[PDB]
Design an enzyme around this catalytic site. Structure first.
Site, PDB file in Angstrom:
ATOM      1  N   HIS A  90      -9.127  -1.805  -5.015  1.00 54.10           N
ATOM      2  CA  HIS A  90      -8.031  -2.100  -4.077  1.00 54.10           C
ATOM      3  C   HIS A  90      -7.036  -3.084  -4.733  1.00 54.10           C
ATOM      4  CE1 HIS A  90      -5.814  -2.282  -0.480  1.00 54.10           C
ATOM      5  NE2 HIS A  90      -5.641  -3.583  -0.707  1.00 54.10           N
ATOM      6  N   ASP A 101      -3.104  -2.596  -5.022  1.00 50.23           N
ATOM      7  CA  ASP A 101      -2.099  -3.613  -4.711  1.00 50.23           C
ATOM      8  C   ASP A 101      -1.156  -3.854  -5.895  1.00 50.23           C
ATOM      9  OD1 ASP A 101      -2.927  -4.104  -2.082  1.00 50.23           O
ATOM     10  OD2 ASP A 101      -4.187  -5.824  -2.680  1.00 50.23           O
ATOM     11  N   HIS A 115      -0.501 -10.879  -4.777  1.00 50.46           N
ATOM     12  CA  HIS A 115       0.921 -10.611  -4.619  1.00 50.46           C
ATOM     13  C   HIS A 115       1.823 -11.724  -5.149  1.00 50.46           C
ATOM     14  CE1 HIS A 115      -0.330  -7.066  -2.653  1.00 50.46           C
ATOM     15  NE2 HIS A 115      -1.008  -7.747  -1.729  1.00 50.46           N
ATOM     16  N   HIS A 132       0.821  -1.208   0.000  1.00 55.93           N
ATOM     17  CA  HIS A 132       0.000   0.000   0.000  1.00 55.93           C
ATOM     18  C   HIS A 132       0.850   1.250   0.000  1.00 55.93           C
ATOM     19  CE1 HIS A 132      -3.298  -2.647   2.059  1.00 55.93           C
ATOM     20  NE2 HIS A 132      -3.031  -3.086   0.823  1.00 55.93           N
TER      21      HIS A 132
HETATM   22  C1  LIG Z   1      -6.298  -8.554  -1.658  1.00 57.39           C
HETATM   23  C2  LIG Z   1      -6.679  -8.293  -0.180  1.00 57.39           C
HETATM   24  O1  LIG Z   1      -7.709  -9.206   0.198  1.00 57.39           O
HETATM   25  C3  LIG Z   1      -5.462  -8.325   0.805  1.00 57.39           C
HETATM   26  N1  LIG Z   1      -5.927  -8.232   2.191  1.00 57.39           N
HETATM   27  C4  LIG Z   1      -5.791  -9.180   3.122  1.00 57.39           C
HETATM   28  O2  LIG Z   1      -5.220 -10.255   2.902  1.00 57.39           O
HETATM   29  C5  LIG Z   1      -6.399  -8.893   4.460  1.00 57.39           C
HETATM   30  C6  LIG Z   1      -7.235  -7.757   4.670  1.00 57.39           C
HETATM   31  C7  LIG Z   1      -7.827  -7.554   5.945  1.00 57.39           C
HETATM   32  C8  LIG Z   1      -7.588  -8.485   6.969  1.00 57.39           C
HETATM   33  C9  LIG Z   1      -8.255  -8.302   8.234  1.00 57.39           C
HETATM   34  C10 LIG Z   1      -8.882  -8.183   9.253  1.00 57.39           C
HETATM   35  C11 LIG Z   1      -9.732  -8.131  10.406  1.00 57.39           C
HETATM   36  C12 LIG Z   1     -10.893  -7.335  10.334  1.00 57.39           C
HETATM   37  C13 LIG Z   1     -11.818  -7.366  11.392  1.00 57.39           C
HETATM   38  C14 LIG Z   1     -11.580  -8.200  12.510  1.00 57.39           C
HETATM   39  C15 LIG Z   1     -12.605  -8.217  13.641  1.00 57.39           C
HETATM   40  N2  LIG Z   1     -13.772  -9.102  13.414  1.00 57.39           N
HETATM   41  C16 LIG Z   1     -13.474 -10.490  12.973  1.00 57.39           C
HETATM   42  C17 LIG Z   1     -14.705 -11.340  12.552  1.00 57.39           C
HETATM   43  O3  LIG Z   1     -15.633 -10.567  11.774  1.00 57.39           O
HETATM   44  C18 LIG Z   1     -16.060  -9.347  12.392  1.00 57.39           C
HETATM   45  C19 LIG Z   1     -14.829  -8.438  12.633  1.00 57.39           C
HETATM   46  C20 LIG Z   1     -10.391  -8.972  12.591  1.00 57.39           C
HETATM   47  C21 LIG Z   1      -9.447  -8.950  11.528  1.00 57.39           C
HETATM   48  C22 LIG Z   1      -6.803  -9.637   6.761  1.00 57.39           C
HETATM   49  C23 LIG Z   1      -6.204  -9.841   5.500  1.00 57.39           C
HETATM   50  C24 LIG Z   1      -4.483  -7.177   0.540  1.00 57.39           C
HETATM   51  O4  LIG Z   1      -4.852  -5.996   0.593  1.00 57.39           O
HETATM   52  N3  LIG Z   1      -3.232  -7.439   0.185  1.00 57.39           N
HETATM   53  O5  LIG Z   1      -2.530  -6.232  -0.057  1.00 57.39           O
HETATM   54 ZN   LIG Z   2      -3.880  -4.567  -0.386  1.00 62.29          ZN
END
Ligand SMILES: C[C@@H](O)[C@H](NC(=O)c1ccc(C#Cc2ccc(CN3CCOCC3)cc2)cc1)C(=O)NO
Ligand SMILES: [Zn+2]
Length: 287
Positions: free
Chosen positions: A236, A240, A263, A77
């Site tokens: 998004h 990325d 990635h 990011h």
């Molecule tokens: C391509 C993209 O998907 C990629 N993102 C990721 O892999 C990625 C994004 C976000 C998270 C997270 C988180 C998170 C949010 C909330 C809660 C609390 N609760 C848990 C149960 O539900 C209600 C809320 C705990 C944890 C984990 C991983 C990326 O941007 N890569 O750059």
């Molecule tokens: Zn990302």
């Protein structure tokens, strides 16, 4: 036309999305031909890791840079923001092994960079120009570079989820007419509740919350205030990709198209492109 760095040093703080650790981030100007260099200032000696494809580690969750037994997690990011604002040279100092997640988008970083100010440098800016198609595939996933006189990023996602039913899952951004800041920078990261609960079981996504990520359950987006864009998820993915593309070390003159890429595949594309010497050249804007 000329290389760009920051005018001033600027600081920010946040939490690492996966590690949950408080991190202090310092962006600093850097000399001509430095590129984006991550500095682990908590270590003695300070470990510098240039944000280059050769320094990427094998990590399924995010883009991680490695040097020795040291890593810098989740760089995509911030790199997207550097790429979006044309920052050639900068030191990115971190007090911990993960770049802070901020609000999950590149918004805070683009604001931080612009707030530090832009400094023109006394060296021609170099671009990596795609000369021929380079493509990588794995199963249903594809990531490709195609020659293009400009910079364009295309992405398609394809989720079997009702939030994605009828929702924009494809987008193309040609940066000659579209602002990285306006239409891409604010797109937040997202996670499916199942995937999130699973990362939590591996003691990952520790810093994650609805305050820094879009959380999608079996039915809907959990975030009470909703989306920043109707196509936020695919935007998004574009954000990325732009960050991963910046691991080439220079602004791109070409087109990227991603089809359910992430990635891992983006990095495989960078490595195949670099190894295919006749598929690219490093040029000035005039050339
Ligand atoms: C391509 C993209 O998907 C990629 N993102 C990721 O892999 C990625 C994004 C976000 C998270 C997270 C988180 C998170 C949010 C909330 C809660 C609390 N609760 C848990 C149960 O539900 C209600 C809320 C705990 C944890 C984990 C991983 C990326 O941007 N890569 O750059
Ligand atoms: Zn990302």
């Amino acid at each position: 036309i000329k290389q760009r760095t920051l005018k001033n040093i600027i600081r920010a703080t946040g939490v690492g999305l996966h590690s949950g650790e408080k991190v202090y981030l310092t962006l600093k100007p850097a000399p001509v031909d430095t590129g984006i260099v991550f500095c682990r200032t908590d270590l003695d000696p300070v470990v510098e890791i240039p944000a280059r494809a050769e320094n990427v580690g094998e990590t399924t969750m995010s883009t991680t840079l490695v040097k020795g037994d040291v890593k810098v997690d989740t760089v995509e990011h911030l790199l997207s923001a550097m790429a979006g604002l044309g920052i050639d040279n900068a030191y990115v100092e971190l007090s911990a092994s993960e770049v802070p997640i901020m609000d999950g988008s590149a918004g805070p970083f683009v604001f931080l960079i612009q707030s530090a100010g832009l400094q023109e440098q006394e060296a021609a800016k170099k671009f990596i120009r795609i000369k021929r198609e380079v493509s990588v595939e794995e199963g249903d996933k594809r990531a490709v570079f195609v020659p293009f006189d400009g910079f364009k990023v295309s992405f398609e996602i394809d989720f079997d989820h009702p939030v994605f039913r009828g929702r924009t899952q494809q987008a193309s951004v040609d940066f000659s007419s579209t602002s990285f800041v306006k239409e891409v920078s604010r797109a937040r990261t997202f996670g499916f509740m199942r995937d999130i609960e699973y990362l939590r079981s591996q003691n990952l996504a520790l810093g994650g919350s609805v305050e820094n990520a879009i959380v999608v359950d079996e039915n809907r987006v959990l975030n009470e205030d909703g989306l920043r864009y109707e196509d936020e998820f695919v935007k998004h993915k574009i954000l990325d990709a732009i960050g991963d593309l910046y691991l080439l070390g220079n602004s791109l003159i070409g087109e990227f198209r991603g089809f359910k890429s992430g990635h891992a595949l983006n990095n495989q594309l960078l490595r195949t492109l670099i190894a295919d010497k006749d598929a690219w050249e490093v040029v000035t804007f005039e050339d």
